[model samples]
Target: REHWATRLGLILAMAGNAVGLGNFLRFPVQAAENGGGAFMIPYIIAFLLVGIPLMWIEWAMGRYGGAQGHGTTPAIFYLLWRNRFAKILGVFGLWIPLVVAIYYVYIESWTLGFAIKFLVGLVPEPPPTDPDSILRPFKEFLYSYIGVPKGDEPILKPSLFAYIVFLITMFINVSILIRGISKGIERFAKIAMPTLFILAVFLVIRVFLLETPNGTAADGLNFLWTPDFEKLKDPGVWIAAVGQIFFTLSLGFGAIITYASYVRKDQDIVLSGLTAATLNEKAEVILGGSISIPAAVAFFGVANAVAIAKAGAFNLGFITLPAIFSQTAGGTFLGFLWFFLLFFAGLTSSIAIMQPMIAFLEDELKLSRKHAVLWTAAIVFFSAHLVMFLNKSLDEMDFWAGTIGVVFFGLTELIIFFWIFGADKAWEEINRGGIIKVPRIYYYVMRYITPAFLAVLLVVWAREYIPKIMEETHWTVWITRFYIIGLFLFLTFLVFLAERRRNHESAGT
Candidate 1:
């Protein structure tokens, strides 16, 4: 079986895997909608109880599962419990990443498009001073650029230029993945992750230094960090914070499980786990919060920034920031750095997400690396186009697999790791050659606190949203749901097909 070439390579890849598009765009919006700084209370609780523990658990599971000559979660689940049902449940490990990666790459291409748009003077001029339309210029540009449905539109027809960029981005992901673990993913992470940070550093410096006519960066910071303690009583706030942790850390998606599979048994996963997680948290809370929210608030008043954030992350990122940069001095180059880093961030994640399904094909079905990747490229090509064509389908797939499926699968992994596999054994594996014993508190935390928190989060989520979904009747929404379930079932069938290998060889041989 393949293995990580070095500790640095592994950590960077792990960090890169977790540092997603969500860091810059998603986090700022969630904090704005939630209780702002009050969101951190549950978020930190989650990081301790849910995030850190799950990281170690998935990491231990992957390395342990990898020992048995498997890199995918279906076989890994079977390794843990020796049951077909466990393998079936583990299909989320494949389905979540595969499906998320489909829409994810499409979104990744946007940064490249924007990067060029800023560099080549496509910087949209602000609409004339109509008090009702301060944000309209970039908003109109963004909608048209992405081919959003407008008046009388029945179907999306993305511009050929946008389509070609998507195709180019797909080719980039495939080319990097073709190089295999240490050479392809790790090598790219070594350069790409550092470059991403450098670019963020530059952009953050420029953003903070801006003296906007409306407000200052501190105005944005105040709104972002202001605590509304009353909002903490809302379960939606709590769940959203937890969900953000799950989303930002890439915790429940099986990418970590698949990534850890390539690690050697002797590796110190606890260290890597904590490092990757804390690295992501720093990037999200400090770097991410500092940029999007601050820039929006500084240039557009706090009220305008709040309105922009309420619209969604895209409104803040694609629409607002481009306008901000266009007005700022040296924004031409600054804009390039901004979106370029975004492209790098998304590219790093897309490749990592794509790795799990490819691993399933290679490890379980014995497909060659080239053959598996080619097949994966084909699936991504078609599925992304399907997402592009159908309105709201991307959000539907994201909600199901990206948000909901992740939490469910996360709790299951925790259950299987400690309960089915044995808590003492799982803890032992986690701290096997690790640093400082991973703290005794985490043992109980993973076994009890983490699982309990996740279940409550899920229950609260369903209690609030299921009614809304039940009342839904849109054809596009229903069609999207069907597509998600259909792909899920297809992955389940593939899991059963891979079951033959386990019958001949038990867990870890």
Candidate 2:
């Protein structure tokens, strides 16, 4: 019912939802490890064909749903497909947001904790050697900061700073959410996104100025931009690129869809949606690609940077980037800039992540906004600790939430919207009241190409990882599965109950 306060705020807020810690932290790792400069070809193709097309669909779906007084996907799906089972299918919509938000809060908290320490000069100075055994202070800082499962550390150990910051992160998100989307989320985005950009730009320039013992910052750019087309031959390259675009655009998690629900049916979502997606892509490809890997390569050579990337995105983000910040003269403030930049990035995206679920509680359950957030927070807080204590829980949950759900749920919505609901109407909805016409070819592309690409992306992605994950025997891994399956049913049951409640209310009316 509430709409964005301004068109610029809406675009920035949408970009806030689209850009996350992934843009700065994850994209660089994917680019460097996959094919360096050559990786952008797949990234471009995937973004152009799949990511952009999907953005328009979500925006169209949301505006259409809102026009009929529905904000959550379950009701949207129900109205579109005119099937009883479609609501059940739409239940998958909340699943990704809920699961991802649980772990995401904890990770975001780490960024704030690091931010505080960096600004306060609490982080240790970098060591002379890059060897793990010798340069282990930052490594241990990460271990102790997040309470990793170390030989010396207890399994469930959580740092005091981490706990406090996590609660603070949760409180900030809840406070903003409870304040309502317009005054809280949109208001926060107006300031946060600009500050995030300023910090990132300053740091990007800082990174460019640095001279390394091993490689130049320019060398890092060369490694990233110098196209190696041969790497795309590997299925893994395509999968990573797909996943990056998928995550970078915040595609298929229905956050964009939910945000678009607030748009006027006649509002310019064409330019608006394109602006948000393009902003996120530039933040990711240009800003994201430039900062972490280039800085890492500048200090440690290209080989070492690639090695750091292969170690993991978090590995580079938590360890190498901090090392970069710690060694600089104002390493203290620069470290602050980098970590706080991520904290804001985390907040903007994390709030967006939680909105769809809150939309469900209020819309489907008929709960007041206060009560809706209370239920959502309680559910997330309890599950967040599941992510906090369990050694592999975040990693485990990561597989199902975005990796699978984004792609699979994507398949479901496209089929329902384009095929089941009919492509003619879907096309009209997208083009309706737009500043620019959506090209006609995309009617065929969205209907045929995007869905087929997603299907193949999932098949190839699963063929690579599912069997390996399935073979795991860890208790935490299996428990995570058990919890996730029941979580799915828990959401499903709510949908079932909501449908009946709506029917009963309708009958009385």
Candidate 3:
């Protein structure tokens, strides 16, 4: 209803949302495994074809929604449904981020814990014999929190320390959120994002300054850019790339819509989304990769390079990256930079995720921001702890939330805007008050590129579901079944409730 007190704040907030764990962790791995440097070709293609366009569409939708002062799903689907489908879809929309909020905050907890260690200079140096040595405490933390069943394979998992980290992070999020968007969200992004960039640049420079362990910069370049093209042909590559694009950009998650809702109708979403998406990608692919992998490689050599590169793109950015940086730079200050930058990144992204849900809870339920935040925080807090203890459950949740939740919502969004709402009408609104005018070709993109790709993504994503159905976990197949069934019902229930609420509200009005 209100304009971003400043346009820059809105842009930073959107950028923050789009650039999260996915950028720092998943992008590098997908790129490295898919084609390394060559991954850039498809990545840039997807960026142009998929990420940017979808971003603009979502941004436009948000701007429109904001003008209407509605949350994401309510604004888009409500316009289409008049009452029924909008409410159903709104519930699904709400469930997605709420689940993500639960899992994601745990990640922020890792960042928070690591940041404290980084700030306090407590992170130990990487041992010469075992490059993964820095991961010792973290691996212990994960396993201890969610112990492997007696005789199960010993996969490194988060520990009780990690759960403690998770709780502290949750508290941080709850406290900041209690302050509401303008004071809590916007103010943090404005300051944190710039600070994040500065630290990234410094880290990148520090990596370059160090002498080569071997005559070749190949380790650095290879870790960052070398693409395994053989892996490119795998459907998994394309699926993952597309998924990461969507995930990294936070498309279909109602975040952009919620953020845009706070902006004046005259603000330029086209320019904002483009800038935010591009910058977000750069932060993830270029800055995150360049700083994180190189720093690890420079100190640890090729094998360590491999592990740390994988680590960079893995969910351990908060734990592993800081540990790696602290070891490489061999000082307290760089550790400070490492964790501080991560903290800001985590905080910025967390705000983005929290905003949409908070808006939905507040506007739709007619609750105050404080009430909505507390409700959402309470839900996420318990949900996160559930995920932390159940390692297998956490993985399964990630599978559903990461792929099903994001891709389905993305498909739902594209179908709604292009097919249901009509791309022409959508485009017109997108161009309105857009900082940059969208090209006419976006129609072609919306009509074909986005929706078609999403369809392909959906099919591929679902094909894997059969495996889950066929092969259940050994000890807890029944529990897994229940969890899967519960997940489905949860999704269904959200849709059902939102629709029911919308219908009741309409009747009342």
Candidate 4:
């Protein structure tokens, strides 16, 4: 059993995995766009009802699996449920992170490129004239930087700088993964998590001190902190709040399960998991919540801020932040700091995403650590290029793999752990070797409330997305669907192969 080198290292690694773009980029935009104060009410509710419980469930599941000499979800599920179908369902645990990592690294690379450009003073200065003019240069730079094709031109060839940054990001991820868990992933998290918090705190202080032309501190605060009660009537706001909590905490991704698998049997998972969740919330609500939306509200009016939120998370982080930084004192330095923060946030999460698959190969197929890491990196490098060149492909991949896939896996885990595996046993497993006792009330919540909550979320999400999928179904959508299906089949095959090997060893014994 490969346990974490230290207790603190495990907690920090879990926190780093949880705190990513969703914290800094997605949360602020969701809050501002969904009626800030109104959003918090549901967000907090969801965190308590869904996030914390799910964290415990995944940690419990992972540690239990690890104790049984299983590192990935399929074997874990099979161990718990004693069924072949459970193993098939468990493929989601490996599949989602593997698929998501493919495109997510591409986005991560953008932060690297932006950071380098800002540090070297290559980022074009925003024009001093009209607002549209101020935004034009940044937009053009982004178009070129991402190799977004224009009109009849082939997908704009990746600029030399963009290609280099992409390779650098990939190299960093592969290098760390090759070092195994404690020395590589845990060590990086220890440095990166503290640095991330410091940078976020520094930015928050700077953002509060600077006043924008459109609004004062008071105005920005009101825009973000005040609640519009009327907006609560909209179901979309509630769904957004829940989804943000789920995504921000890194609940559905197999990264949590993979990290928890490295925990020692005697370690207190309840307290450790709770502490990591608390740290993630602090970074997200206190630090991340303070910067982007408030600054956007202050600089651009509330209307434009709303528009920026609608433009998507990548746009808000990459395009909006740089534009704001350019107008402020020491804009270049601030821009570099902001993008570097994003790069670190992205790097930590990306490293975790690859771990489950690498662990799967190592544990299931009996591959060496180096061989597993290299294979995982090779697969992602090839798959990511599809997303990099095709404009629509990224969105399609994100919609299925990143969005819906996580919820599906999370829901399945809850049902299997609480309902199928037996809530009483699951409760005992969670409480075993724990320092702080979880409330007795949560036993019921984990069994009833959490599953109920997840079911509603899944229903609403599917209800909303199914119509859009039907109306807009096209070649690009079909291609993405086929790719996902192919990936699923491949993972299932691996699970079957591993099962045969395990059974053969059992018979020989």
Candidate 5:
């Protein structure tokens, strides 16, 4: 474990990871759908209290791990509990990336497909009809192209072409990764990232110039910024904000820990996290939100934008927004611009997800880059196909990964930082080499307030699960719940078993 060769490289990689699918697509949709302007309240609040602090925790842990010349999980668990249980928990951090990659690539593939269509002029010009209607044709087109027959019931039904694209993307990921960090992840981010920003600005400017058929600019800006306080009372809004914060930041997945492991000893952990989080939020809210929502409104009108909001965060970005972009001013050009941006964002985040396991394979298993990447890539390719097996299970798994998986894992990380890792030591590590001292009150906030907020939100989410039960037959609901709970328990047991083996080895006479 060594510090990144330079500060700029670390920032580029961190920023690239932070500004992924969550920023460009999810934030705007969540804002518009949840409460318009009102959603910003919870979003900004979560960012300040939970998001930033937790990022500081990850960065600090990584820096500490790098100091010990250890990989992510080994460093944290070994540093804190010095026991099997902790190391097992750390492994959860490793497993999430591979699991997440399974579906993330599926979404990324959509962007890739759309980007190609845009280039080849296969995507048609905007239709003259209600924007909501755009979804029906799009779904049909997807089904037809992928060869998913109408009423087909396979949960993991991937089109032959879909699997081909997935493997190719996986190969690309492996190639970049085996090249090592500086030339691979760092270099790619540096080039693609700034270009992403510039392209976004150009799209926003073009969007601002458009007028509705009525000779006025559509109510795009107003729809984006206006508050609907009525949405606040809806419990789903808050849960969404909290859940989104965790997902957007990629917290608790050990990606940040692995990235941080490359940093040099004297690097400023707290400031780096703060700066990265600051820029990340700016990109998402100011750049991403302002540009995406208004642009969606300008093209499809407020009604369609609302439809997108209700579609959920990830869906809004990958599916709905791309269609809307296809209908925008300079529709074809913007379509290309938008999905290319998405592809870059997806690539950066995907690399972050894959890095931790690669590091473990190399550091712990003593595998070479080629061997580690080949083995890991094979696992990811196989796992991704499992997602297409059962539509219901796949949908439920998406919900689990997007909400419960992210939140539960994030909460676990925060608990480890505040409780097991020693809050005082955590604070010291977070503040090392920073221009500003983190307020003493943050200790109390991190230890108590944020945890309590997450707990309340988690409870709210759990309670809201009841209504779905009422909507479905008892047996169906029970089966879905049983599947999720059983999967979680089984995975937890396996982790603990692995920890026992690691501990026994470490404790050898």
Candidate 6:
């Protein structure tokens, strides 16, 4: 079986996979919009009740599947539950990441493209305007660079630079996957993860030291840390906290399970899981919290900062931050560093998303690693164009593949692993070769609390999102649903063919 070349390599790769744009972009927005400091209350509670346990569970499940020579979730589920339907449900573990990576890599390319633009002194100077309107020029810049329509402009043409950057990103990802676990993924992680942290630290320091016309660094800190206690009373706040934890940790994506599958049987996953989680939280809470909101508040003040926070993740990253960078001291150099760090963060996570699908192809279909990598790249390359050229396509894909699909798969895995497979056996597997003893309390948490949390989360999400979905025009809704259904059917058909082939080989033997 393939194994992580070194414990450090494995840990860094895991950390790199978990640390993404979510850490630096999404986390701050969530914290700001929810309750700021009050958000931390539920956030920490969710982390304890949900995040850490799921980390251990996915690692244990992946290592168990690996020991039996399985790499993907369908086989892993079948091995654990001994149920055919469980294997069918397990297909989402492979499906969601495959879909998410299609759009995610496109966004990653924008970061890389922006970084290159800064390095080459191509970033345009912000027009002299009011602080509130400062983001206008940057928005136009993004529209031009990313080929998105602005206002009355008919059919934006695809930017050649954006397409080239997208291809470069895809090539880098496929090249890494082709190197297999140790040399490719691990080596890149070792370099990328450390550099990610260093760059983040630099930004954090600069942001803190920044003095704007409106507020000080302390104002940003107060905005983030000063809890509005009344906001905690809302169920929406708790739900947001739980959702953010899942997204921030890259949970429910099946990428963690695929990463864990490369571990040697004797390695201590307990410590490794905790270490990666700790690192991710640090990046999110310390570095992520410090940079964007603080910098924005310092420049724009609390009112405009709050508006920017509500303007969506991509807007905050692509539009708001660029405007801030244009005004800051040494703005050009810092802009390059900021976007470069995002590129590393994104590339690492996108690579993890690709692995489970490639592993599925290699393990179940008997494809060679090179062929699997090439095939996966071909699929993503074609599908990504839809999102690259269209606005709504990216939103639809992100909502289904990255948001709802991940939660559904995660909830399914928890049920199959802890409830159906027997928590007693699963707990024993978690403890075996574990350096630190997992608390007995968590066995109960895994069996009851985590699944319960997921179910409630799903119900709350449905209550919130279903109406919004239903409100869309019939054509738009049907098209989006059909797109998802089409992808699901395609993946399921592949699994069916592979299983049939496996049965034939076994019968002949």
lDDT of each: 0.85, 0.86, 0.68, 0.86, 0.71, 0.85
lDDT of 3 by residue, 1-509 (tens): 44567778877877887777676656656665554565665676777888888888777777777676686575457775565665566655666676667667776666666667667766555555454576675554333444544456423356566667777777777777787667777777788788888888887777666554442333666755655566556676677677777778887667776777777777778877788888997898778777655555556665655555454334344445555554554555775666677767777777677776788766656678889888777767766655665545555555666567777887788788777787778878889876578888878988888788878878876787547644765554345346545644765664456557877999999
lDDT of 5: 0.71
Model 1 lDDT-worst window of ten: 126-135
Model 5, residue 334: displacement in angstroms?
2.1
User: Poorest 10 consecutive residues of model 3 by lDDT?
Assistant: 311-320
Q: TM-score of the candidate numbered 5?
A: 0.88
Cα lDDT for residue 238, candidate 5: 79
| Cand. 1 Cα-lDDT | 0.85
Off by over 4 Å in 6: 151-156
Q: Rank the candidates by TM-score, best first.
A: 2, 4, 6, 1, 5, 3
Residue 347 of model 3 has an lDDT of: 70
Tens-place lDDT digits, model 2, residues 91-179: 87888888989888889999999999988888776555545643477888888877888674335578998898898889989998997
lDDT tens digits by residue: candidate 1, 311-378: 87588888788777777677767878888889999998999889999999999888899999999999
User: Model 5, which residues run further than 4 Å from truth?
Assistant: 125-137, 145-149, 155-159, 214-218, 228-230, 311-330, 392-394, 466-509
Candidate 4 lDDT, 258-315, residue by residue in tens: 8898898778999999999999999998888888887888888788888988887667
Per-residue error for 399 in candidate 4, Å, reads 1.4
Please give the distance, in angstroms, between residue 223's alpha carbon in candidate 3 and its true position after superposition.
4.7
Evaluated at residue 505, the lDDT of candidate 1 is 62
Off by over 4 Å in 3: 125-161, 212-218, 226-232, 299-304, 307-329, 464-509
